[PDB]
Every structure is written in C-alpha cells, then in structure tokens.
Tab-separated table of C-alpha atoms and ligand atoms in Angstrom:
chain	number	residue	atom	x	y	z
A	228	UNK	CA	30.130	105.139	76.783
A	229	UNK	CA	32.716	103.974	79.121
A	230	UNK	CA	36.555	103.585	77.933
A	231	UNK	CA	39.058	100.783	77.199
A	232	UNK	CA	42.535	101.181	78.041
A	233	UNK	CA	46.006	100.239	76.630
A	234	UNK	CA	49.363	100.126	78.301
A	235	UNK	CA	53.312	99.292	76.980
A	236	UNK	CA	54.293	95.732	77.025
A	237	UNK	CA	57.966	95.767	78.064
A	238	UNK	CA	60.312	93.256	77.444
A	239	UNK	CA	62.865	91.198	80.140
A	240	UNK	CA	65.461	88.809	79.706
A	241	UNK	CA	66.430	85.705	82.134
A	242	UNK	CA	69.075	87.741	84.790
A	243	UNK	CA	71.485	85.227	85.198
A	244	UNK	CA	72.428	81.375	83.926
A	245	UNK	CA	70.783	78.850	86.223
A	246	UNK	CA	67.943	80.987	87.465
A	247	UNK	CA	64.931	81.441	85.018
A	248	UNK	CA	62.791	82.860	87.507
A	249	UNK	CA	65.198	86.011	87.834
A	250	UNK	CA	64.722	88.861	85.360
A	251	UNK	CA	66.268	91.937	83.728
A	252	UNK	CA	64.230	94.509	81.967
A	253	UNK	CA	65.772	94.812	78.128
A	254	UNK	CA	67.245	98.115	77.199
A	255	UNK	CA	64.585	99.777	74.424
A	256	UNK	CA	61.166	101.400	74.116
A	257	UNK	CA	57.868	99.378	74.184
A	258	UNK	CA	56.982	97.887	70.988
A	259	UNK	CA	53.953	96.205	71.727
A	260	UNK	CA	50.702	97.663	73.579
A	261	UNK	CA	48.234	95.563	74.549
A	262	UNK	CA	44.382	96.468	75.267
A	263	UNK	CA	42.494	95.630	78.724
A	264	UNK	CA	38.899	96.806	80.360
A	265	UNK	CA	41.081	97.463	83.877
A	266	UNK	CA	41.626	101.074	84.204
A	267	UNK	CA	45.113	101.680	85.763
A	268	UNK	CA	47.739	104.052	86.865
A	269	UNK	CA	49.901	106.169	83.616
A	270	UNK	CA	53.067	103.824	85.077
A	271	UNK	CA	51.182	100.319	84.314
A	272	UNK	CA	52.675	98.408	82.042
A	273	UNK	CA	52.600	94.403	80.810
A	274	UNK	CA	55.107	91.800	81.275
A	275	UNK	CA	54.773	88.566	79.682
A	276	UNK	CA	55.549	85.385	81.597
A	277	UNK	CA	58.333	83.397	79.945
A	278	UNK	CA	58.852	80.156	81.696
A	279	UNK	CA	56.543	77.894	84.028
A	280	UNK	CA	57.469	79.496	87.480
A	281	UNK	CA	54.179	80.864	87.994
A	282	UNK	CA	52.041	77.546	86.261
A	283	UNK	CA	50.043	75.421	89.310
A	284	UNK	CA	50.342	71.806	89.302
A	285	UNK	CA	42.535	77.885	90.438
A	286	UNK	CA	44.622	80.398	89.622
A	287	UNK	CA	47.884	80.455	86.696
A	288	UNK	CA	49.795	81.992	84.992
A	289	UNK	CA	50.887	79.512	81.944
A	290	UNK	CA	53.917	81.113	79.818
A	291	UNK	CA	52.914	83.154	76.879
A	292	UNK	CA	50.377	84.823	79.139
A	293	UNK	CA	50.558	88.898	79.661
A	294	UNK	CA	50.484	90.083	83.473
A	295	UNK	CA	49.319	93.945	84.047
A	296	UNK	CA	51.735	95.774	86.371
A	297	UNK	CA	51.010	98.764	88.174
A	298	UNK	CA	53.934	100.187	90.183
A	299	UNK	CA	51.039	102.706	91.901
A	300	UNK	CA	49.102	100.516	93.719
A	301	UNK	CA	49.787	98.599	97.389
A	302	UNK	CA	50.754	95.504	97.586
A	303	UNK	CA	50.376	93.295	100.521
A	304	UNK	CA	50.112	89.230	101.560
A	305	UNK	CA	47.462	87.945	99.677
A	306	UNK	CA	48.088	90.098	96.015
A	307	UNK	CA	50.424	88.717	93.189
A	308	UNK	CA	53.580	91.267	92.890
A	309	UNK	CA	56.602	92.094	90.714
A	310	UNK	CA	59.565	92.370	93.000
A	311	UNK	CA	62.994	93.734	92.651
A	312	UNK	CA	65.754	91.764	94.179
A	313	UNK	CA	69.275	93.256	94.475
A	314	UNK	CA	68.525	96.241	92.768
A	315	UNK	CA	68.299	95.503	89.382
A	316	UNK	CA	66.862	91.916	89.049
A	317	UNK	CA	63.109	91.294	89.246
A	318	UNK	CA	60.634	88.116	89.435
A	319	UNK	CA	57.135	87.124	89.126
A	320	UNK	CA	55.556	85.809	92.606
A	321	UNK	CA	52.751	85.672	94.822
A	322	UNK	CA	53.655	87.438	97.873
A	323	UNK	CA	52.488	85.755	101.263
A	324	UNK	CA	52.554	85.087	105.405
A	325	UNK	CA	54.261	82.260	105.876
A	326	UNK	CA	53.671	81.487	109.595
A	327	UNK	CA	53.966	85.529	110.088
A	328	UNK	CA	57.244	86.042	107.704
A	329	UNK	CA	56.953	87.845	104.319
A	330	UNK	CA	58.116	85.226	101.298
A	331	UNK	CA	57.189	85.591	97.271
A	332	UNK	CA	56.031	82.308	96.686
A	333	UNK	CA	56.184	80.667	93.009
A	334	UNK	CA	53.573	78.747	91.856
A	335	UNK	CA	55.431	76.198	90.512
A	336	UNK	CA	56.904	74.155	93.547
A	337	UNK	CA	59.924	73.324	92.057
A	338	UNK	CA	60.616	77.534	92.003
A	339	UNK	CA	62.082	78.571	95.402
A	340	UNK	CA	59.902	80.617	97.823
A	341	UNK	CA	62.350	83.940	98.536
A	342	UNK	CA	62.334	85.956	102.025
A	343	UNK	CA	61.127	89.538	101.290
A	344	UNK	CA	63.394	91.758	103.428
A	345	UNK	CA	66.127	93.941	102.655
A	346	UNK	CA	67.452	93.331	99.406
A	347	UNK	CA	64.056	93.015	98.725
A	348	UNK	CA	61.426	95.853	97.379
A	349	UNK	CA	57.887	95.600	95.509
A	350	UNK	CA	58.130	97.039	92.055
A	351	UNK	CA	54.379	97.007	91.333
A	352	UNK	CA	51.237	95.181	92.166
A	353	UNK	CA	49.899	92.414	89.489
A	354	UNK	CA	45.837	93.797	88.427
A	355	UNK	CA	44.991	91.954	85.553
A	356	UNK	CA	46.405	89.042	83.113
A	357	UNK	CA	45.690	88.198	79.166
B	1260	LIG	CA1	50.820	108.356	88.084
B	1261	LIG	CA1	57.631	81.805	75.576
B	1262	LIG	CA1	44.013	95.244	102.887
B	1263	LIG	CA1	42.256	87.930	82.137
C-alpha cells in the first residue's frame, strides 16, 4: 500500500536576450503539479526544460520534458544539478571534473560548459524526469 507523490511545477523565463540557457524563476504560485513514484524532500519541485541545452547529439533531456528538483539533497560531480549563477539567474547542467576543476556541463555542445566557483551555488539536485 505504498504512496505516490506530487510536487509544484514552477515556471522560469529565459534571464537575458542572447542566452537561452540562463533562467529566471516567474513571479506567481504553482499552477501545475505533477505526479511521480520518487519520494522527495517538502522543497522539491519540477521545472520544465524549454530549449535544447540539455538534448545529446544515453541520457536527455529533450524540451517539453519535466526535471524533479530537490534543493535538500547533495549534489556532487557525477549528478545533474540546478545552479544559481549571480544570484538570481539559474540553469540546467550536468555538473562534472573536468581534469580536477568543477564545470556544469550542457548536453548540447553548442551550450557553453560554465566554471562552478564563486558566483556560483547549487540550488538543488536533479532526482527524477517526466
Ligand atoms: Ca524539508
Ligand atoms: Ca517548449
Ligand atoms: Ca558520493
Ligand atoms: Ca522518467
């Protein structure tokens, strides 16, 4: 008699002109809930990819599809992440070693692989997809 779970999709907008990759969370309450098997923290929540930054030339994540976020669990090389860069902008990347240095790497080649340092923090690790 186990239990299915359900957490707020929240919406995001492209943060600036010439960078898709780069987003801002929309002002306004979730809407939308969508309904998963993976049992996660109260602070999960869904994103839905909007663009091809994280679609492979086997894992993908093709636009339209919904990404689980949970802020509560550790991230580290390896694990796909949300993070926040600058403070209020966020994107959608796998976060790896590359020879020893920390980078969020797209998917998509032709999306920039970004240096995760300072102006750099991990909003929540990425658990599940629909
Ligand atoms: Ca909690
Ligand atoms: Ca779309
Ligand atoms: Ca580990
Ligand atoms: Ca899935």
């Amino acid at each position: 008699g186990s239990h299915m779970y359900e957490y707020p999709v929240f919406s995001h907008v492209q943060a600036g002109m010439f960078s898709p990759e780069l987003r801002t969370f929309t002002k306004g309450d979730a809407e939308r809930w969508v309904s998963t098997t993976k049992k996660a923290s109260d602070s999960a929540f869904w994103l839905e990819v909007e663009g091809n930054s994280m679609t492979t030339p086997k894992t993908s994540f093709p636009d339209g599809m919904l990404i689980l976020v949970d802020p509560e669990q550790a991230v580290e090389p390896g694990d796909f992440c949300i993070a926040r860069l600058g403070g209020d902008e966020f994107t959608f990347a796998k976060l790896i070693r590359d020879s020893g240095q920390v980078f969020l790497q797209p998917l998509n080649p032709q999306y920039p692989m970004i240096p995760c340092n300072e102006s750099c923090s991990v909003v929540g690790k990425v658990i599940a997809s629909q």
